[PDB]
Structure formats: C-alpha cells, structure tokens
Amino acid sequence: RRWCFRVCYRGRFCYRKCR
Secondary structure (H helix, E strand, O other): OOOOOOEEOOOOOEEOOOO
C-alpha cells in the first residue's frame, strides 16, 4: 500500500515526508 514518501540518499540519508 502507498503512504508517505521519503527520499533516501544513495541507500542512505532519507528525508521522510508525509502529506
């Protein structure tokens, strides 16, 4: 299921973000 999208940085460093 889909829910909030977080961008990771090269398999590391992610910026969760729900909206």
